[PDB]
Structure 1
Amino acid sequence: AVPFVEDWDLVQTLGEGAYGEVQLAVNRVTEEAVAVKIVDMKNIKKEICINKMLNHENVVKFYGHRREGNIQYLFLEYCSGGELFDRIEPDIGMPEPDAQRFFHQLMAGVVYLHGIGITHRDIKPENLLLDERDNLKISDFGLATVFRYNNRERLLNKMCGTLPYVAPELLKRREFHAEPVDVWSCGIVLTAMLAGELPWDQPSDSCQEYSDWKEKKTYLNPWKKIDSAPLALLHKILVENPSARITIPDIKKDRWYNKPLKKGAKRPRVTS
């Protein structure tokens, strides 16, 4: 049925890394675009497994995979907007309304993942992609894992993530709950979106920037650029004790989270 519809052309490189490269693939017939993650197999098995059980508007869709010898081909959703990382201006951030909208969407995606027992473990601007309408989608489940199965939660112990975004308990406790960790990384992402900089190299007492935060020195560079409303949310998210840290349902009740700020997407306009 309909010849050539199976053929995809690798038009360009969307990004590379330490395992594979991601390229934009365009269908020969329909011209539909998708992102193909090429992993030179010479982790990936679990990534595919996790991706197959993902279906949400704020999570990069997985279409399928092609073994073909050793080179593994993962067909994923193409997000023309690129990485949220590139939408963050160094030392500045982005307009608060935009950050709020992206944060809302990030929360939606994380609620979904946690809802099906999956923790991402490496949430950062480089892994949050944007589609044509700037809708945020969580990507790269290479470090993800199931933390809840048969309604039984499994505590984590593996060191995973990226230091500036990792929660403090991952560095000082043998075991820890999965959810507060993703929540913390989302808080670091929010900070980056509102200030254009990361607060610390890592959440450890030996890190001066981290000690200052614990001491409420918000008059210092990072926090001084953030308005009081979102800063109060950050004070609830970036809490060292994961058991006292705000949970997502409570984040959804936060004053800034619910503050009207962002208008629609300027759809219509014809005065007179």
Structure 2
Amino acid sequence: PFVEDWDLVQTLGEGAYGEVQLAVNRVTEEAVAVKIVDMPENIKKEICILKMLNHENVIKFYGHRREGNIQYLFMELASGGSLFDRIEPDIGMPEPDAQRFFHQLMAGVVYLHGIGITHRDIKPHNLLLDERDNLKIADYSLATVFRYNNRERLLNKMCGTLPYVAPELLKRREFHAEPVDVWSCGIVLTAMLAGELPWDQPSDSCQEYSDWKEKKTYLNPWKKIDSAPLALLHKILVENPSARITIPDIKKDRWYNKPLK
């Protein structure tokens, strides 16, 4: 397949809406990524969000091309693949690599929150790496505006991936966008350190979640995590979104600031 001067050489994944392909410009040899979307209101929103994005830990938007009922979303290519592929099942990854990616994830989330944007699907599959292993937050199809004209809007729609969602998202009619993103960053952190997800959803029915609230840290995935990153997770994975730690205080955490090998 092809679009204009770009050849679509290889699939890079597929979401709820479309497929992402590796686009090699036949002339310049430049390699980008193209989200191919079939058929209207959400894509106009997504482009609007993407156009604003200007940060080193956020996937750069290049432009869009419409070819009838098909939309092509040209984005920055992260040659290093995803963070998912760097996590070893049941092991995770080395602590210094986990801390580095967590720092870059915080920088990107701080950025998005700064411009009133919530990602709503922070998980390893949406965290891509460049050639120098710099983390990039990708896929903005679930992203939305939580702040406009310095007025905050509570979210009501239930969006995301169940093992990453904050518990208020399942139990509340309305909730603040930012503690939802902080929570998923905490699950990403857990995955990086234990190569395991803590539960299937943060609901009282799920025993693994109830075990966490009871402080049963002698259980997986918690027993694989060192006491210092575990202290941070104790503050991130808090049920009440008002009691939950914010990025300014995450930036003050001992493990966050711990010099690592």
Same fold by TM (over 0.5)? yes
| TM-score, normalised by the number of residues in structure 1 | 0.93
Q: Would the alpha carbon gap of residues 31 and 5 (structure 1) be closer, same or farther in structure 2, given more than 3 Å must change?
A: farther
Work out the percentage of aligned pairs sharing the same amino acid: 95
Q: Specify the SS of the correspondent of 1:185.
A: helix
* TM-superposed deviation, 1:19: 2.3
* TM-superposed deviation, 1:30: 1.6
5+ residue gaps, structure 1, are: 262-271
* TM-superposed deviation, 1:4: 14
5+ residue gaps, structure 2, are: none
Larger Rg, first or second structure (1 or 2): 1
| TM-score, normalised by the number of residues in structure 2 | 0.96
* TM-superposed deviation, 1:18: 3.3
* TM-superposed deviation, 1:108: 0.2
Is the Cα contact below 8 Å between 1:147 and 1:155 reproduced in 2?
yes
* TM-superposed deviation, 1:6: 6.3
Give the Cα separation in 2 of the matches to 1:17 and 1:5.
20
Give the Cα separation in 2 of the matches to 1:242 and 1:18.
28
Q: Specify the SS of the correspondent of 1:244.
A: coil
Structure 1 residues 229-260: Cα deviation after superposition (integer angstroms, max 9, x where no partner):
00000000000000010000000010000000
Q: Would the alpha carbon gap of residues 4 and 144 (structure 1) be closer, same or farther in structure 2, given more than 3 Å must change?
A: closer
Is the Cα contact below 8 Å between 2:2 and 2:8 reproduced in 1?
no
Q: Specify the SS of the correspondent of 2:36.
A: strand
Q: Specify the SS of the correspondent of 1:82.
A: coil
Is the Cα contact below 8 Å between 1:80 and 1:131 reproduced in 2?
yes
Give the Cα separation in 2 of the matches to 1:166 and 1:17.
17
Say what the alpha-carbon RMSD is for the aligned residues. 2.5
Which residue of structure 1 lines up, in the alignment, with residue 59 of structure 2?
60
Structure 1 residues 149-196: Cα deviation after superposition (integer angstroms, max 9, x where no partner):
110111111100010000000111111100000000000000000000
Give the Cα separation in 1 of the matches to 2:75 and 2:93.
28
Which residue of structure 1 lines up, in the alignment, with residue 111 of structure 2?
112
Is the Cα contact below 8 Å between 1:96 and 1:194 reproduced in 2?
yes
Structure 1 residues 34-58: Cα deviation after superposition (integer angstroms, max 9, x where no partner):
0011011192221111001110000
Q: Would the alpha carbon gap of residues 220 and 101 (structure 1) be closer, same or farther in structure 2, given more than 3 Å must change?
A: same
Give the Cα separation in 1 of the matches to 2:164 and 2:55.
24
Which residue of structure 2 lines up, in the alignment, with residue 269 of structure 1?
none
Give the Cα separation in 1 of the matches to 2:53 and 2:198.
32
Give the Cα separation in 2 of the matches to 1:155 and 1:18.
24
Q: Specify the SS of the correspondent of 1:164.
A: helix
* TM-superposed deviation, 1:16: 2.5
* TM-superposed deviation, 1:12: 1.4
Which residue of structure 2 lines up, in the alignment, with residue 12 of structure 1?
10
Q: Specify the SS of the correspondent of 1:221.
A: coil
- The more displaced of 157-166 and 41-50 is 41-50
Is the Cα contact below 8 Å between 1:25 and 1:35 reproduced in 2?
yes
Is the Cα contact below 8 Å between 1:92 and 1:195 reproduced in 2?
yes
- The more displaced of 40-49 and 21-30 is 40-49
Q: Which runs of 4+ in 1 moved over 3 A?
A: 3-6
- The more displaced of 18-27 and 53-62 is 18-27
- The more displaced of 22-31 and 214-223 is 22-31
Give the Cα separation in 2 of the matches to 1:191 and 1:136.
17
